Amino acid sequence: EMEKEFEQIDKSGSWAAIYQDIRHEASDFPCRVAKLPKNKNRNRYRDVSPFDHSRIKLHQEDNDYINASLIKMEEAQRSYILTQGPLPNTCGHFWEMVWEQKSRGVVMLNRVMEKGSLKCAQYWPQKEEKEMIFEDTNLKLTLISEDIKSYYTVRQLELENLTTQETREILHFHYTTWPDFGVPESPASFLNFLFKVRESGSLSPEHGPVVVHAAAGIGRSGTFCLADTCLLLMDKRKDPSSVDIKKVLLEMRKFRMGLIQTADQLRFSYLAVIEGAKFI
């Protein structure tokens, strides 16, 4: 399989050399809107910037900026919005996006706190009584239910547009067990989580794109998107052994920078795609 390539990169210990080469081969495009003076307070520090060609635009006339990009995988017929972890003052923008892009699912690959720091804002409510109103974008948000499993949490949230009084159910998939440092030892958890997301309808064409997010320079979001896509492609191509992760990763990197921050993370993607393919 691509396992043969995996095993061989392991033997010659060349993950770093392969990773550098992908890093070097990947696309560079301008982020001028991101770099603008007025959007400084809308960018998470140390995070990635969105390319102009692919950024999501808020449907507001005055400032349409949010740090997020649409990743459109044409052959897998699959779309994703990857964003930064909402900031204290961009939770309303975040939820605005979700509403406007007709999203069904949010996918969170980090804990609110890791390494004893806040990685993002508590952007969703923790108790069903204590609902959140976002005044700047006129959306209300309400916890409907929350099922805490050993390696991830599903939440049903209700997103109401206070302007039209129209309402939507959003599923919130939170992967709660990625280690503070490194990549998981085994990909079993991560795949089950992928499949729980897939199983919800959240990734399917009848909905808008899934909004996926993690924390500043820690990756994860690409690993999720990359794994999902590769697996799809193996399932639909006449020749499954022709799905090159590097070729998919590079393609997917035309849309946002820093999917896959490390050689280790690269290796872990190979791992998950290999195991998940065996499973499917």
Curated annotation (Swiss-Prot):
<feature type="modified residue" description="Phosphoserine; by PKB/AKT1, CLK1 and CLK2">
    <location>
        <position position="49"/>
    </location>
</feature>
<dbReference type="GO" id="GO:1902202">
    <property type="term" value="P:regulation of hepatocyte growth factor receptor signaling pathway"/>
</dbReference>
<feature type="modified residue" description="S-nitrosocysteine; in reversibly inhibited form">
    <location>
        <position position="214"/>
    </location>
</feature>
<dbReference type="GO" id="GO:0030948">
    <property type="term" value="P:negative regulation of vascular endothelial growth factor receptor signaling pathway"/>
</dbReference>
<dbReference type="GO" id="GO:0046627">
    <property type="term" value="P:negative regulation of insulin receptor signaling pathway"/>
</dbReference>
<dbReference type="GO" id="GO:0030968">
    <property type="term" value="P:endoplasmic reticulum unfolded protein response"/>
</dbReference>
<dbReference type="GO" id="GO:0061098">
    <property type="term" value="P:positive regulation of protein tyrosine kinase activity"/>
</dbReference>
<dbReference type="GO" id="GO:0097443">
    <property type="term" value="C:sorting endosome"/>
</dbReference>
<dbReference type="GO" id="GO:0045296">
    <property type="term" value="F:cadherin binding"/>
</dbReference>
<dbReference type="GO" id="GO:0098794">
    <property type="term" value="C:postsynapse"/>
</dbReference>
<dbReference type="GO" id="GO:0008270">
    <property type="term" value="F:zinc ion binding"/>
</dbReference>
<dbReference type="GO" id="GO:0034620">
    <property type="term" value="P:cellular response to unfolded protein"/>
</dbReference>
<dbReference type="GO" id="GO:0005829">
    <property type="term" value="C:cytosol"/>
</dbReference>
<feature type="modified residue" description="Cysteine sulfenic acid (-SOH); alternate">
    <location>
        <position position="214"/>
    </location>
</feature>
<dbReference type="GO" id="GO:0005737">
    <property type="term" value="C:cytoplasm"/>
</dbReference>
<dbReference type="GO" id="GO:0043507">
    <property type="term" value="P:positive regulation of JUN kinase activity"/>
</dbReference>
<keyword id="KW-0256">Endoplasmic reticulum</keyword>
<dbReference type="GO" id="GO:0051721">
    <property type="term" value="F:protein phosphatase 2A binding"/>
</dbReference>
<dbReference type="GO" id="GO:0010460">
    <property type="term" value="P:positive regulation of heart rate"/>
</dbReference>
<dbReference type="GO" id="GO:0046875">
    <property type="term" value="F:ephrin receptor binding"/>
</dbReference>
<dbReference type="GO" id="GO:0032991">
    <property type="term" value="C:protein-containing complex"/>
</dbReference>
<dbReference type="GO" id="GO:0004725">
    <property type="term" value="F:protein tyrosine phosphatase activity"/>
</dbReference>
<dbReference type="GO" id="GO:0008285">
    <property type="term" value="P:negative regulation of cell population proliferation"/>
</dbReference>
<dbReference type="GO" id="GO:0033157">
    <property type="term" value="P:regulation of intracellular protein transport"/>
</dbReference>
<dbReference type="GO" id="GO:0010812">
    <property type="term" value="P:negative regulation of cell-substrate adhesion"/>
</dbReference>
<feature type="binding site">
    <location>
        <position position="261"/>
    </location>
    <ligand>
        <name>substrate</name>
    </ligand>
</feature>
<dbReference type="GO" id="GO:0071732">
    <property type="term" value="P:cellular response to nitric oxide"/>
</dbReference>
<dbReference type="GO" id="GO:0005158">
    <property type="term" value="F:insulin receptor binding"/>
</dbReference>
<dbReference type="GO" id="GO:0071456">
    <property type="term" value="P:cellular response to hypoxia"/>
</dbReference>
<keyword id="KW-0702">S-nitrosylation</keyword>
<keyword id="KW-0904">Protein phosphatase</keyword>
<dbReference type="GO" id="GO:0051898">
    <property type="term" value="P:negative regulation of phosphatidylinositol 3-kinase/protein kinase B signal transduction"/>
</dbReference>
<feature type="modified residue" description="Cysteine sulfinic acid (-SO2H); alternate">
    <location>
        <position position="214"/>
    </location>
</feature>
<dbReference type="GO" id="GO:0019899">
    <property type="term" value="F:enzyme binding"/>
</dbReference>
<dbReference type="GO" id="GO:0004726">
    <property type="term" value="F:non-membrane spanning protein tyrosine phosphatase activity"/>
</dbReference>
<dbReference type="GO" id="GO:0010977">
    <property type="term" value="P:negative regulation of neuron projection development"/>
</dbReference>
<dbReference type="GO" id="GO:0009968">
    <property type="term" value="P:negative regulation of signal transduction"/>
</dbReference>
<dbReference type="GO" id="GO:0005783">
    <property type="term" value="C:endoplasmic reticulum"/>
</dbReference>
<dbReference type="GO" id="GO:0044344">
    <property type="term" value="P:cellular response to fibroblast growth factor stimulus"/>
</dbReference>
<dbReference type="GO" id="GO:1904753">
    <property type="term" value="P:negative regulation of vascular associated smooth muscle cell migration"/>
</dbReference>
<dbReference type="GO" id="GO:0030061">
    <property type="term" value="C:mitochondrial crista"/>
</dbReference>
<dbReference type="GO" id="GO:0098554">
    <property type="term" value="C:cytoplasmic side of endoplasmic reticulum membrane"/>
</dbReference>
